[PDB]
Swiss-Prot record, chain B:
GO CC term (a single one): preribosome, large subunit precursor
Biased composition regions of type Basic residues, renumbered to the chain: 1-8, 15-25
Subunit structure: Component of the pre-66S ribosomal particle. Interacts with NOP7, RRP1 and RRP15.
Official protein name in the record: Nucleolar protein 16
Gene behind this protein: NOP16
UniProtKB/Swiss-Prot annotation, chain C:
Localization terms from the record: Cytoplasm
Extra remark: There are 2 genes for uL29 in yeast.
Described function: Component of the ribosome, a large ribonucleoprotein complex responsible for the synthesis of proteins in the cell. The small ribosomal subunit (SSU) binds messenger RNAs (mRNAs) and translates the encoded message by selecting cognate aminoacyl-transfer RNA (tRNA) molecules. The large subunit (LSU) contains the ribosomal catalytic site termed the peptidyl transferase center (PTC), which catalyzes the formation of peptide bonds, thereby polymerizing the amino acids delivered by tRNAs into a polypeptide chain.
Subunit structure: Component of the large ribosomal subunit (LSU). Mature yeast ribosomes consist of a small (40S) and a large (60S) subunit. The 40S small subunit contains 1 molecule of ribosomal RNA (18S rRNA) and 33 different proteins (encoded by 57 genes). The large 60S subunit contains 3 rRNA molecules (25S, 5.8S and 5S rRNA) and 46 different proteins (encoded by 81 genes). uL29 is associated with the polypeptide exit tunnel.
Cellular component aspect of the GO annotation: cytosol; cytosolic large ribosomal subunit; preribosome, large subunit precursor
The keyword Phosphoprotein is annotated on this UniProt entry: yes
Protein family according to the UniProt entry: Belongs to the universal ribosomal protein uL29 family.
Superkingdom assignment: Eukaryota
GO BP of this protein: cytoplasmic translation; maturation of LSU-rRNA from tricistronic rRNA transcript (SSU-rRNA, 5.8S rRNA, LSU-rRNA)
Gene: RPL35A
UniProtKB/Swiss-Prot annotation, chain D:
Function: Component of the ribosome, a large ribonucleoprotein complex responsible for the synthesis of proteins in the cell. The small ribosomal subunit (SSU) binds messenger RNAs (mRNAs) and translates the encoded message by selecting cognate aminoacyl-transfer RNA (tRNA) molecules. The large subunit (LSU) contains the ribosomal catalytic site termed the peptidyl transferase center (PTC), which catalyzes the formation of peptide bonds, thereby polymerizing the amino acids delivered by tRNAs into a polypeptide chain.
One Gene Ontology cellular component annotation held by this UniProt entry: cytosolic large ribosomal subunit
Subunit structure: Component of the large ribosomal subunit (LSU). Mature yeast ribosomes consist of a small (40S) and a large (60S) subunit. The 40S small subunit contains 1 molecule of ribosomal RNA (18S rRNA) and 33 different proteins (encoded by 57 genes). The large 60S subunit contains 3 rRNA molecules (25S, 5.8S and 5S rRNA) and 46 different proteins (encoded by 81 genes).
Protein name in UniProt: Large ribosomal subunit protein eL13A
Organism the protein comes from: Saccharomyces cerevisiae (strain ATCC 204508 / S288c) (Baker's yeast)
Family membership noted in the UniProt record: Belongs to the eukaryotic ribosomal protein eL13 family.
Residues of the full protein shown: 8 to 129 of 199
From Swiss-Prot, chain E:
Protein name listed in UniProt: Large ribosomal subunit protein eL8A
Function of the molecule: Component of the ribosome, a large ribonucleoprotein complex responsible for the synthesis of proteins in the cell. The small ribosomal subunit (SSU) binds messenger RNAs (mRNAs) and translates the encoded message by selecting cognate aminoacyl-transfer RNA (tRNA) molecules. The large subunit (LSU) contains the ribosomal catalytic site termed the peptidyl transferase center (PTC), which catalyzes the formation of peptide bonds, thereby polymerizing the amino acids delivered by tRNAs into a polypeptide chain.
The encoding gene: RPL8A
Record family assignment: Belongs to the eukaryotic ribosomal protein eL8 family.
Top-rank lineage group of the source organism: Eukaryota
Length: 80, 130, 60, 122, 184, 51, 186, 72
RNA sequence: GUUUGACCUCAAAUCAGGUAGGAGUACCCGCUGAACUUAAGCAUAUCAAUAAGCGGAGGAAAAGAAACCAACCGGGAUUGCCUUAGUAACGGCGAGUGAAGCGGCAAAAGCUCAAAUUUGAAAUCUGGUACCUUCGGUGCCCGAGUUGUAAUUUGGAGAGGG
RNA sequence: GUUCUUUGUAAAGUGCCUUCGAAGAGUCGAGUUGUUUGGGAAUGCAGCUCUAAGUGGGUGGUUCCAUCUAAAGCUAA
């Protein structure tokens, strides 16, 4: 899809709506329920999970702790 | 069974109905001429050919004037209201037979009726009178 | 003697006591009354007078 | 050498054996006798038309139709609403296209109208 | 303060009626006939109350009590059903069609002012379905029309047409344009 | 955008205008500009009175 | 008349008038209950051609249902409209579901306006055009899919295409899966 | 007598057409005829609607909106 | 008029009158839904659109008066039985699945709304209430109702006049 | 069968002449995932995206032709 194709798709069920004059208790009930369920891909979900992942998500500490968890599990299955 | 076991054991009593002989032989009802001349020992179609009358108008699957004169014998053998009559009295006494003038009159022909309606209704009035 | 006295003071009017009413059965104490069932529409009565089911015989 | 046996399902639950063949023939004859006892002078069935079957295979054959038409009934000299009271089946959706079928039906109606004896309402 | 649910809902609906930008086939309402012309429309329309159920019953028993024992023109009244008013416009028999501004579903009467401008029927959007209801033996009426008239009231009606044309249709030629409700 | 470009091995980025266009889809905010959301109702049919 | 103007008005749903009408009413229906009673039909034209007469004994209920259903596509193959009709069938158990129509829709909820007849009302028990609903063969037509949308979802119609469901799919399955054996074996 | 003309319904459909305004895509479509022409207009209409016979009737309908609004 | 009054929407009341639940469940209408098994081990498939579970009806239910079938010299709502017929079609074209039109016969029956003004008249209806010949009728009253109840009209056309 | 009521310029029907004359939208459809069918023709249905027209629209059949009237409802055997 090019720019021209999306400009067509942009005209929804929900276009031509004022948003700045209106009280918040009305818009907070519109915006919850104004989401057109467009088809997704796995290819996109990959990149958006690669975009949100921050720096301290997987340090040395939590890697060593993860192995410290799995060693305890491997011990607990010889306790029987 | 569960319920039948108790009902055959209880002192209530069964609601016994012996309606089996009534299933075969049902009396003919809709015509007294046919009701007098119907041999119950014969079947349905046999009692039709005995009388003469056709029982099935389509040709059947399978292999197949005594009374009809009496039927033929018994088969060969609307006024106006007070206000309507008095209305036609008024029209005849004022006009007579000029139906054009009679129907163009606003005072007596209040319902703006045609000439044919007027001559028909007046002749009904004239037959019942002199 | 009590019940028939109550039957006499509630004689021929709408709403008599639920015990003095007919028992019949639940399914029949609903289900359209003889007037409401035999009640035909205004159009069908005109059609029935104009064209009733005529009686006939086919041979002579 | 072929054979196909449809006994892979729980077939033994749905086995209908028609022991009531003799019982149900008696039951229909009793039904006809009752209907003819209630509809006394009248036949037992409406006057049905003559009709040509569809398909290259059966277009040789002439069969019973459902009802006539408004056209065949009018040409016979009566109305559809009155034909039903005399026991002539009327088909509104059927069309008239073949002349031989048409004329056969009109004569079937005309001969029917000569043979009948309509009772007065009195 | 704490209000009920329904009170809060109708107050919220009131402020929602103002603060949204509205399509010009609506807000063609609320640009409605002013106090003098409204009172003068009803000074004519009150002379043609449809004969109330009691009045009709007593008169038709008077017909029976007289005529059965021992000529009239067709009487004129206001015409008041939406099926019947939109029948009368397009006949074309309507000389003044009165339209309520407050209708329960708004979508009911949205075509009507512009269909009246199309047919050449001199319409006036008057304020209140209750106020229309009063002149017509009903709680509410949505529409009231005046087909035919007595000749005493004829000249007044023709002037009521011309006053409404000048007061309503000429002042509100801008109302076919302009999306209403941009109030800050 | 997390995916690899076909022209070159370098990461495929998006223009400012495209990113603006995606956001204006998701908050609905009028995609095709140079148009009025609130045009006056030009009565193309009621202009001419019926006889 | 007047309803032809209405009918052809409601065929345009994204048109700017009916866009605005639907914008206000979708929010207003969220503020109320899930199943609540309507004062009168919002679309009286479509109500009337689905058989709503504005007389005593005739009820309009407004109803709300969630939309949608591969865990998130484990399907649930019954409609939203039949679900709605059944819920109003249970809250108003004295009535009989006649028909229902679409009124407004949303990302999360589809709305309907069911039309209901009171079979116990004497203005329904007389008048021979509507007293068919008093016959106890119509106790919960919406629960057995005998309404317009139910007959659609059952796939009940005429032709080649509905051969598997013309007399009902359970009936035709049971009939064609029956070893029929005669007294004199065919 | 397939679609018998019916003078009144032609009037009613066109009467609602002018009153209701245009749907947001049709609002784009009528801008697209004046600027880009019927070529791209039918392309967008076909993607928007179901089939091509849909897009024929729709772009022609919009061309009659333009033909009446501009001239007469 | 800082008052009074129409409406609209939403409530309440041991208000007047009604109605729904639970049982039974063979058959009937839906919803929901497996597995053992059988296929060569086996994600398709098969058992099976089955059993179990959940809802909803009656004496039958459902279906039903074509947005049907056909290709004829055309038939004519549905349903059921014989036939089509293990045929057409589906399927690791494997295990296996598997109709329908026609023809014969059983039984047969047709209709009703919405959409065009009653506008020389809401002609309609529920309830309360007093009588009477009480599955109801009549009188009076409160209402429902024009955001549409009645009569007319449904393609087989139909309507207004003559 | 016998009998009491019927009415009001009341309700129809037939044929001709004369003047008019609407038909069910988040629905058909298209895409789409899932279910389902003998239905390879994509058989039905359900969800989601998008969403029509009236010399319309659907369904079939070798340039066209035939046959239906959907998206409203009742009805014994």
């Amino acid at each position: 899809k090019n720019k021209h194709d999306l400009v067509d798709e942009g005209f929804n069920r929900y276009t031509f709506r004022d948003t700045e004059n209106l009280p918040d208790w009305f818009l907070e009930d519109e915006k919850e329920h104004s989401k057109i369920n467009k088809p997704i891909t796995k290819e996109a979900a990959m990149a958006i999970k690669e975009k949100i992942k921050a720096m301290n998500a997987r340090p040395i500490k939590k890697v060593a702790e993860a192995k410290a968890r799995k060693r305890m599990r491997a011990v607990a299955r010889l306790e029987k | 069974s569960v319920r039948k076991r108790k009902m055959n054991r209880s002192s209530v009593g069964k609601a016994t109905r012996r309606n089996k002989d009534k299933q075969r032989k049902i009396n003919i009802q809709s015509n007294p001429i046919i009701a007098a001349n119907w041999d119950y020992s014969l079947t349905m179609a046999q009692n039709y050919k005995k009388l003469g009358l056709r029982a099935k108008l389509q040709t059947p699957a399978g292999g197949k004037e005594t009374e009809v004169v009496k039927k033929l014998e018994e088969l060969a053998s609307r006024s106006q209201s007070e206000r309507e009559e008095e209305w036609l009295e008024k029209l005849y006494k004022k006009h007579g037979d000029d139906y054009k003038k009679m129907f163009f009159d606003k005072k007596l022909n209040i319902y703006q009726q045609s000439e044919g309606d007027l001559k028909r209704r007046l002749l009904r009035w004239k037959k019942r009178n002199g | 003697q009590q019940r028939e006295a109550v039957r006499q003071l509630y004689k021929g009017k709408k709403y008599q006591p639920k015990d003095l009413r007919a028992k019949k059965t639940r399914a029949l104490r609903r289900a359209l009354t003889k007037f409401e069932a035999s009640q035909v529409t205004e159009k069908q009565r005109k059609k029935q007078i104009a064209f009733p089911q005529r009686k006939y015989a086919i041979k002579a | 050498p072929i054979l196909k046996n449809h006994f892979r399902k729980h077939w033994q639950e749905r086995v209908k054996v028609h022991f009531d063949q003799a019982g149900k023939k008696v039951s229909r004859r009793n039904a006809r006798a009752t209907r003819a006892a209630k509809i006394a002078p009248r036949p037992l069935d409406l006057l049905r038309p003559v009709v040509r079957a569809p398909t290259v295979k059966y277009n040789r054959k002439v069969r019973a139709g459902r009802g006539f038409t408004l056209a065949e009934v009018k040409a016979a000299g009566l109305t559809a609403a009155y034909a039903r009271t005399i026991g002539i089946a009327v088909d509104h959706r059927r069309q008239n296209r073949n002349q031989e079928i048409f004329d056969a039906n009109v004569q079937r109606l005309k001969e029917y109208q000569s043979k009948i004896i309509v009772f007065p309402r009195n | 303060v704490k209000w009920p649910e329904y009170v809060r809902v109708q107050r919220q609906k009131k402020i929602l009626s103002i603060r949204l930008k509205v399509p010009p086939t609506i807000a063609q309402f609320q640009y409605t006939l002013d106090r003098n012309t409204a009172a003068e429309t009803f000074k004519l329309f009150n002379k043609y109350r449809p004969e109330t159920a009691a009045e009709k019953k007593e008169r038709l028993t008077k017909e029976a009590a007289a005529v059965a024992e021992g000529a009239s023109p067709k009487p004129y009244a206001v015409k008041y059903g939406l099926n019947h008013v939109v029948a009368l416009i397009e006949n074309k028999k309507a000389k003044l069609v009165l339209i309520a501004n407050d209708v329960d579903p708004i979508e009911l009467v949205v075509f009507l002012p512009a269909l009246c401008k199309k047919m050449g029927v001199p319409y006036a959007i008057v304020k209140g379905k209750a106020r229309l209801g009063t002149l017509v033996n009903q709680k509410t009426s949505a529409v009231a029309a005046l087909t035919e008239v007595r000749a005493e009231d004829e000249a007044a009606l023709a002037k009521l047409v011309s006053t409404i044309d000048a007061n309503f249709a000429d002042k509100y030629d801008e109302v076919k344009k302009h999306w209403g409700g941009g109030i800050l | 955008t997390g995916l690899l470009d076909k022209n070159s091995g370098s990461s495929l980025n998006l223009t400012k205008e495209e990113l603006e266009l995606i956001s204006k889809i998701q908050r609905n905010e009028q995609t095709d500009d140079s148009i009025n959301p609130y045009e006056p109702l030009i009565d193309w049919f009621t202009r001419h009175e019926e006889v | 008349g007047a309803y032809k103007y209405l009918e052809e008005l409601q065929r345009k749903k994204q048109s700017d008038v009916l866009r605005f009408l639907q914008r206000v009413r979708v929010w207003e229906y969220r503020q109320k209950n899930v199943i609540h009673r309507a004062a009168r039909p919002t679309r009286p034209d479509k109500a009337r051609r689905l058989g709503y007469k504005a007389k005593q004994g005739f009820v309009i209920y407004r109803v709300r249902v969630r939309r949608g259903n591969g865990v998130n596509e484990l399907k649930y193959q019954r409609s939203l409209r039949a679900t709605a009709e059944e819920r109003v069938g249970r809250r108003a158990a004295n009535l009989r579901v006649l028909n229902s129509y679409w009124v407004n829709q949303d990302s999360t909820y589809k709305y309907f306006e069911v039309i209901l007849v009171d079979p116990q009302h004497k203005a329904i028990r007389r008048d021979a055009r509507y007293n068919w609903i008093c016959d106890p063969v119509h106790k919960h037509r919406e629960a057995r899919g005998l309404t317009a949308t139910g007959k659609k979802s059952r796939g009940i119609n005429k032709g080649h295409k509905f051969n598997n469901t013309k007399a009902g799919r359970r009936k035709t399955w049971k009939r064609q899966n029956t070893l029929s054996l005669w007294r004199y074996r065919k | 007598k397939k679609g018998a003309a019916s003078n009144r319904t032609k009037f009613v459909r066109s009467l609602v057409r002018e009153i209701a305004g245009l749907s947001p895509y049709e609002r784009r479509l009528i801008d697209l005829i004046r600027n880009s022409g019927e070529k791209r207009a039918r392309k967008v209409a076909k993607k928007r609607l179901g089939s091509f016979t849909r897009a024929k009737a729709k772009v022609e309908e919009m061309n009659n909106i333009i033909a009446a609004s501009r001239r007469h």
